[PDB]
Amino acid sequence: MATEKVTKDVASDLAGQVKFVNLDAEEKRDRQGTTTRIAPKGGLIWVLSGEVYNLPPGAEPVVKNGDRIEAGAVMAETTVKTEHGGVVRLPEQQDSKGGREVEIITASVMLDKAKVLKETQQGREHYIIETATGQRFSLKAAPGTKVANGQVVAELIDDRYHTTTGGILKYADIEVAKKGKAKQGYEVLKGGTLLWIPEETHEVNKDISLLMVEDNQYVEAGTEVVKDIFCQNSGVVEVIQKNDILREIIIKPGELHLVDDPEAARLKHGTLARPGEEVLPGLVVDTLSQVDYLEDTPEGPAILMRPVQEFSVPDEPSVPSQDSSDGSGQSIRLRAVQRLPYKHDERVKSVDGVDLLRTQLVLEIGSEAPQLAADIEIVTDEVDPEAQRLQLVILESLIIRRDIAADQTQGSTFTSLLVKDGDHIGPGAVIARTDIKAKQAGEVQGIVRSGESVRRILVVTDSDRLRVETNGAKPTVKVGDLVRPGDEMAKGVTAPETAAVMAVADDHVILRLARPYLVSPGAVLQIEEGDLVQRGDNLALLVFERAKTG
């Protein structure tokens, strides 16, 4: 063949309601084409003029068909509800692209009896939480920051577990959770004592010729073991070299007791000699010490008594008093945990001091919280006294768009807030109601008669109605008729414009303005009988066969 399939669509030139008059509407189903609204014979689509209002998706109409409404009346209202009801907080006038924000604290915990201060000292300002016990915690989250579940909030400022240099760490009755060190070490589960044997380890790579000390030579703090390396502590210098170059030098504090045949001693190089024990005949141990067999030291073979210091570790750390307002499936807590960053027999190579027990407050949420949550932490003022307190809150932020001025397709809007800044709200409660104002006064027509699908409302105004005066005649037109220009509706009176007469009396006839649209056969209807359309809305699309050059 030699033709081409074309489509021209028929858009309405006015807002109104769609009426089929003598228009067969067919629903055609094909094997793959499926459903298609067609006008098999073609016809007329009438648009009864009216001001059509698109409603927001939550709108519930407050007007029924036939009501007469003044201009600016509320045609429908929408409601904003709260999922997971809690205590409402109303934020500032943050014109975030116009919308107002409302937050709902669904759960909260606050450290009562603990005061937050801002220690301008220590370089730059830091938040410090002081408890009634006197403990000071450095706050590790600046105000207004979101905090995930399990995150460390504050860290105890604690010099009881700070060492002088590196060394060797062993446990005694302490049971830790074998967690990956991804969380800064191992959590303490059962308490006990932790034993620390100092040794100052220096990583070096210069050749052995750059040594100013002999192996296992006891040295004082001020001396320089290497020309560029000064030691920080007094002790025995252990020199590790494997390739004619120094690998590391270790300074081992202790008490040197001279011996012949150190291996012959009774307590072995398995160390850990309790006070009062005889490592060697005539040698008794004063304080808890570790045996260190040394041969080829200056002054001959010896055994070094490494002094081990102990740190007592409680099963649970001291927990600050906290008041929890938990609700709605969410349980919030600040759990106090003790973390050991070092393993139970690890050699901690260091020159300067080391901290080996970190006490931390850890966020604990998610008893039944879906997808966990995030705690926004704030520094608020306590109700009774004049101090500052720390609080962590899970909130639900809802946004109310401000309002809209009237446009062609929608009326003006007026939002109204039903809740105050300190109210205890329940689940599903209404916090805001939005009114959709009318543009012009008129009579409401054609609400979607189904429920929750009320998307458009038509209102006929004095720009869609016309009263035509029949003076002496009786009108020759009936209430159902569609008049065209020039048509005799009554004796000596003709229709001024296309419309449908809505009321017929003896003195007057009232007609609703309408526009017809011709539809060629086989056109695809884009609209259903009774649908409310705006200007430019597609009513149908006509399918043409056109000459195609080629």
Curated annotation (Swiss-Prot):
Disulfide bonds: none annotated. DNA-dependent RNA polymerase catalyzes the transcription of DNA into RNA using the four ribonucleoside triphosphates as substrates. Belongs to the RNA polymerase beta' chain family. RpoC2 subfamily. In cyanobacteria the RNAP catalytic core is composed of 2 alpha, 1 beta, 1 beta', 1 gamma and 1 omega subunit. When a sigma factor is associated with the core the holoenzyme is formed, which can initiate transcription. This is DNA-directed RNA polymerase subunit beta'. It comes from Thermosynechococcus vestitus (strain NIES-2133 / IAM M-273 / BP-1). The gene is rpoC2.
